Coordinates of N, CA, C and O in Angstrom, one line a residue:
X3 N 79.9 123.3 96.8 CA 79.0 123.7 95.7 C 78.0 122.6 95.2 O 77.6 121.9 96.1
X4 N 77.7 122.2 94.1 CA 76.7 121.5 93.8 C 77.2 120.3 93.4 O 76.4 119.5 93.1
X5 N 78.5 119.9 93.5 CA 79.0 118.5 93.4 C 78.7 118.1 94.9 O 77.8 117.2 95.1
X6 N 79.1 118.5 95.8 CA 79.0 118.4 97.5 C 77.7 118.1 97.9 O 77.3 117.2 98.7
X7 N 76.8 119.2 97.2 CA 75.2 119.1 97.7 C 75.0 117.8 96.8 O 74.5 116.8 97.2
X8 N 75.2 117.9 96.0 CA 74.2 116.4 95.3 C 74.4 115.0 95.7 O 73.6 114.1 95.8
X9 N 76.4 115.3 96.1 CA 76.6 114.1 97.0 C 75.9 113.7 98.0 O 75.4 112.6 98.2
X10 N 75.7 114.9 98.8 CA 74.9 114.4 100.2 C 73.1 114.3 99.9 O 72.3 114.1 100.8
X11 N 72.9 114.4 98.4 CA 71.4 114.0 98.1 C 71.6 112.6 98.0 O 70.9 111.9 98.7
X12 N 72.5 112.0 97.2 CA 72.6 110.5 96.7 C 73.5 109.5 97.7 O 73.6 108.3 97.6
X13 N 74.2 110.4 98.9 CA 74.8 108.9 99.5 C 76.4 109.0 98.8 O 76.9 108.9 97.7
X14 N 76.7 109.1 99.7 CA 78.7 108.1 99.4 C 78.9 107.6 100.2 O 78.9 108.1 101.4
X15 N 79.5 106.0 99.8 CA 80.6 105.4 100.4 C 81.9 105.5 100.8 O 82.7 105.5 99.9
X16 N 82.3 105.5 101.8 CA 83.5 106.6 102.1 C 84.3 104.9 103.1 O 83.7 104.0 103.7
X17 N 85.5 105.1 102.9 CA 86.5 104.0 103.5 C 87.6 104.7 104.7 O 88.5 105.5 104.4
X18 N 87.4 104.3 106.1 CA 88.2 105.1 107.0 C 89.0 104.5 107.5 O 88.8 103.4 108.0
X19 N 89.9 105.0 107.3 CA 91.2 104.1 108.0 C 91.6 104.3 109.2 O 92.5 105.0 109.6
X20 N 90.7 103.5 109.9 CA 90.5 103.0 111.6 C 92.0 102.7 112.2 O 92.5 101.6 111.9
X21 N 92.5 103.5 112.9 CA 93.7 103.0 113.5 C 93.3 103.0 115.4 O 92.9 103.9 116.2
X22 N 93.5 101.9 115.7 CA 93.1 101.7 117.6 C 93.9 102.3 118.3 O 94.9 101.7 118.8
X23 N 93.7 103.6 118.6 CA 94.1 104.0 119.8 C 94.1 103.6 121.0 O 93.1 102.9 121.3
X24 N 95.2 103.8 122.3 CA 95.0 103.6 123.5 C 93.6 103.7 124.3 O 93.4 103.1 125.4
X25 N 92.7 104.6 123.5 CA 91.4 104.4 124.6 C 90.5 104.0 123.1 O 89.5 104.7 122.8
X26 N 90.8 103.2 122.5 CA 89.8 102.8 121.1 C 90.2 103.8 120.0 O 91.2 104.5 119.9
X27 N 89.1 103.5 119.2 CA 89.0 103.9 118.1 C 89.1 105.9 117.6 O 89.5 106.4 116.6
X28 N 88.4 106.5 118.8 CA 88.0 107.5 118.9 C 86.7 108.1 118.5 O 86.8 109.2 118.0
X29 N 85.4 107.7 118.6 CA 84.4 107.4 118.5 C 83.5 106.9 119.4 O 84.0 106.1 120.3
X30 N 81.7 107.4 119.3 CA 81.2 106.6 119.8 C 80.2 106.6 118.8 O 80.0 107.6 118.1
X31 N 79.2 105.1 118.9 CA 78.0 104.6 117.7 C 76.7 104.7 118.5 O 76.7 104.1 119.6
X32 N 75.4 105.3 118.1 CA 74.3 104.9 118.9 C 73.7 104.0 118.1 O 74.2 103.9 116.9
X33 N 72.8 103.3 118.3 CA 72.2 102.6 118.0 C 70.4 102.6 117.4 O 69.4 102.1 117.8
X34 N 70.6 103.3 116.6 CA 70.0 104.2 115.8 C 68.7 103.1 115.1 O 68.8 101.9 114.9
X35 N 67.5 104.0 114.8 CA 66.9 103.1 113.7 C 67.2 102.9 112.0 O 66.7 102.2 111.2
X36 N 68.4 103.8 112.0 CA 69.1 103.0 110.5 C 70.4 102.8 110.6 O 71.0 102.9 109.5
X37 N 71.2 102.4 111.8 CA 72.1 101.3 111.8 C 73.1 102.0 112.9 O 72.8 102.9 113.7
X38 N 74.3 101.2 112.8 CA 75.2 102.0 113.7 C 75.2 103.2 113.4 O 75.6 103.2 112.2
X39 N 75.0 104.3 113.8 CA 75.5 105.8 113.9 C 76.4 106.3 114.4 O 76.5 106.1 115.6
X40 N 77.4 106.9 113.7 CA 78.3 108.1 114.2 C 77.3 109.1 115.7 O 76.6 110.1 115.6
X41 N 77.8 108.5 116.5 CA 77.0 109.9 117.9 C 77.8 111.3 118.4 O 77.5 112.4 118.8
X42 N 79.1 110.6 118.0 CA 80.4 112.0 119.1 C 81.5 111.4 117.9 O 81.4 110.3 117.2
X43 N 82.5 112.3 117.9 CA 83.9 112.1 117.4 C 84.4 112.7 118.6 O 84.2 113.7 119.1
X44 N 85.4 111.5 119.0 CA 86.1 111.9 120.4 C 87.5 111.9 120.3 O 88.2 112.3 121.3
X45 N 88.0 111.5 119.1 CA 89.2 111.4 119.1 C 89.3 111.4 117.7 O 89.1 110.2 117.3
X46 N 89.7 112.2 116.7 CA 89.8 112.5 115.0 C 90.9 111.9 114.9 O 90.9 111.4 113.8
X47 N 92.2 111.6 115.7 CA 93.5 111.0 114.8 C 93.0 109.6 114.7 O 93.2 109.0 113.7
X48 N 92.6 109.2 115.7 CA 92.6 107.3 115.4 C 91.3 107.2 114.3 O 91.1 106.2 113.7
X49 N 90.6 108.1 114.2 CA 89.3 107.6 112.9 C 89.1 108.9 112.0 O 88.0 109.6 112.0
X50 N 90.7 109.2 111.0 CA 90.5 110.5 110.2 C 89.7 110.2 109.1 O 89.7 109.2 108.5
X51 N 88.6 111.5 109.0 CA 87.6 111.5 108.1 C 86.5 111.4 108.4 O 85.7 112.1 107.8
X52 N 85.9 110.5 109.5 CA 85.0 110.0 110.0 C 83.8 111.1 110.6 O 84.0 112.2 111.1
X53 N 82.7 110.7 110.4 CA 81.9 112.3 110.6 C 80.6 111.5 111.5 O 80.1 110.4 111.6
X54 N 80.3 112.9 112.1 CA 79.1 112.8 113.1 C 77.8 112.1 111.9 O 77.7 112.6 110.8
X55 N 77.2 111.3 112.3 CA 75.6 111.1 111.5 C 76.0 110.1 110.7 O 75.0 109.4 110.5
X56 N 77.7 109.3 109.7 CA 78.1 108.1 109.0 C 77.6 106.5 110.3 O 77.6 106.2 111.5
X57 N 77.2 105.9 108.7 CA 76.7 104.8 109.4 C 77.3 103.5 109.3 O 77.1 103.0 108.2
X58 N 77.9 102.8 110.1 CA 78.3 101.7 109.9 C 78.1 100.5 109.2 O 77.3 99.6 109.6
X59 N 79.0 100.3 107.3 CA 78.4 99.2 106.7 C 79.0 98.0 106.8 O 78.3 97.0 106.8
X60 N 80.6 98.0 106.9 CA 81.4 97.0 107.2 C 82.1 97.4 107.8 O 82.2 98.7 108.0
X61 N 83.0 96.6 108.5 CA 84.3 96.2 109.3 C 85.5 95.2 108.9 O 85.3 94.0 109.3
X62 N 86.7 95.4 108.0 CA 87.1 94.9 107.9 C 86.9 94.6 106.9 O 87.6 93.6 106.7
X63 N 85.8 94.9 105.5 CA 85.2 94.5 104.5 C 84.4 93.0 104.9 O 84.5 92.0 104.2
X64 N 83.6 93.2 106.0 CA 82.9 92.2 106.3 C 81.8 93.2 106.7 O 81.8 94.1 107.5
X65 N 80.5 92.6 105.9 CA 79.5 93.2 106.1 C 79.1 93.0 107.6 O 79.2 92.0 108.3
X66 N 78.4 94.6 108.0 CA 77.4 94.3 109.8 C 76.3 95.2 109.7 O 76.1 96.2 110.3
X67 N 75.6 94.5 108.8 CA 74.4 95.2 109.0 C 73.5 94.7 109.7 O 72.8 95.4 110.4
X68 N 73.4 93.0 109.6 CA 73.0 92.4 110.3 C 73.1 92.0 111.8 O 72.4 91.4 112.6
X69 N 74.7 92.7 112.1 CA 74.9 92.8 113.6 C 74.1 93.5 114.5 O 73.5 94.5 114.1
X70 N 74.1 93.0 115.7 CA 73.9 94.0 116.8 C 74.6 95.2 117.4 O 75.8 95.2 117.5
X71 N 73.7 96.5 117.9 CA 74.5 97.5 118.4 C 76.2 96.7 119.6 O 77.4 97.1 119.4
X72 N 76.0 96.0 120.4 CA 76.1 95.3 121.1 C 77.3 94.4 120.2 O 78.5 94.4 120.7
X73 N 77.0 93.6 118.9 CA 77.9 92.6 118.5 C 78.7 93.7 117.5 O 79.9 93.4 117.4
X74 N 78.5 94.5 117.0 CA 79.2 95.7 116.2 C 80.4 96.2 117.7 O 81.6 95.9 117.5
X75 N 80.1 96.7 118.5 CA 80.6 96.8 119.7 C 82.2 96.0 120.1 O 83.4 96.3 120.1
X76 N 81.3 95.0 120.3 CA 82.2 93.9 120.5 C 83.3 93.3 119.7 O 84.3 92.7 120.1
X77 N 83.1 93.7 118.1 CA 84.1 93.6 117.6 C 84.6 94.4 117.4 O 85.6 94.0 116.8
X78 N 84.6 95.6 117.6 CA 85.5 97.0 117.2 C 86.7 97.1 118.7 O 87.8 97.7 118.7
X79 N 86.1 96.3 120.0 CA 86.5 96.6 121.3 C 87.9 95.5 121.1 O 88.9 95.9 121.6
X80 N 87.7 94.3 120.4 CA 88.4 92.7 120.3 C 89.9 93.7 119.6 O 90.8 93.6 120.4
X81 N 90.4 94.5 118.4 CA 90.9 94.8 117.9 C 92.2 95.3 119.0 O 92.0 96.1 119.8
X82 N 93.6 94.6 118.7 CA 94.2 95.4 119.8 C 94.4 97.0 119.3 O 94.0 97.6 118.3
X83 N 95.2 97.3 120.3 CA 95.8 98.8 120.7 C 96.9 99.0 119.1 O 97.7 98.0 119.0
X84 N 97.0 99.8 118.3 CA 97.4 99.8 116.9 C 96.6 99.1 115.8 O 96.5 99.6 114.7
X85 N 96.1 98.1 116.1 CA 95.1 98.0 114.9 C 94.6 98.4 113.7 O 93.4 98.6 113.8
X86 N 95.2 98.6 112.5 CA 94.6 98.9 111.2 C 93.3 98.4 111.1 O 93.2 97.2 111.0
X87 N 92.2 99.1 111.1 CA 90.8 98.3 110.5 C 89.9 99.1 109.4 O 89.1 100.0 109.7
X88 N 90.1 98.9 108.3 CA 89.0 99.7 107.4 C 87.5 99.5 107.8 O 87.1 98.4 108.1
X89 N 86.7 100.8 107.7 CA 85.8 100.9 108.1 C 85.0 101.9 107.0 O 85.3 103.0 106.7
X90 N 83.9 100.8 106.5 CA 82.7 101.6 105.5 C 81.8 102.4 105.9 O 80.8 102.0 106.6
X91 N 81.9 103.0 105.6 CA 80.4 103.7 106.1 C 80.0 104.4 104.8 O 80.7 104.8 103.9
X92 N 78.3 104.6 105.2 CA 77.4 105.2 104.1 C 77.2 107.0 104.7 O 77.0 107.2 105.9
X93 N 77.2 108.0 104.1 CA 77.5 108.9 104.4 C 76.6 109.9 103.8 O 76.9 110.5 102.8
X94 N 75.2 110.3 104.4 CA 73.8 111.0 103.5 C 73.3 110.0 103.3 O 73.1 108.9 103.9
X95 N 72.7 110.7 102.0 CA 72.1 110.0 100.9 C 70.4 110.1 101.4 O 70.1 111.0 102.2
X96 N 69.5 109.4 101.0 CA 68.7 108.8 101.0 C 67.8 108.6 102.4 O 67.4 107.4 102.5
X97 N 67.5 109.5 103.5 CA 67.4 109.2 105.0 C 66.7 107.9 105.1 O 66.5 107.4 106.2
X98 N 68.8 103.0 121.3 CA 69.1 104.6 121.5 C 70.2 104.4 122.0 O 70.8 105.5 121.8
X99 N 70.9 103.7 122.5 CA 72.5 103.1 123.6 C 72.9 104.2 122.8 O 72.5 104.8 121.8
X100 N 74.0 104.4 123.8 CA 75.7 105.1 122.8 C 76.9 104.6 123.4 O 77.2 105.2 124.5
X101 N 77.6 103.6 122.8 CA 78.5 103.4 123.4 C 80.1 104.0 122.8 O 80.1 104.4 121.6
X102 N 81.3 104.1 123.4 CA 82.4 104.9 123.5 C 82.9 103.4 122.5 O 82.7 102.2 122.9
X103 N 83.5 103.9 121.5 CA 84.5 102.4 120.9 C 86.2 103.3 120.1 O 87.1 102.6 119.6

């Protein structure tokens, strides 16, 4: 209803609790002109919550905005197999690679 729609007019920060599955995270990110993007949910148990079109703000409560598609990548890949990692993303609000993580 109109709490829902207004949210997705203004933007929420939403916190996922990234657990590393056997083939990653269960996701993939493109490389988007406004940051990492949610492209595919390929696997919902290792990244519950997590939605097609959220954009990558931190990792670990370490900002990457300033990262590369490529170094965002690379750190989500470093994480072993069980891995707890909180993961921010910005979610609406305010409006090419794809790689598998």
């Amino acid at each position: 209803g109109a709490m829902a729609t207004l949210y997705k007019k203004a933007g929420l920060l939403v916190t996922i609790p990234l657990i590393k599955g056997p083939k990653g995270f269960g996701f993939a990110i493109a490389d988007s002109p406004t940051g990492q993007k949610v492209k595919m949910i390929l696997d919902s148990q290792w990244c519950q919550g997590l939605q097609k079109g959220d954009i990558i703000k931190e990792i670990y409560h370490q900002n990457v905005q300033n990262l590369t598609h490529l170094q965002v990548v690379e750190v989500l890949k470093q994480f072993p197999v069980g891995a707890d990692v909180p993961l921010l993303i910005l979610r609406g609000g305010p409006p090419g690679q794809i790689t598998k993580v």
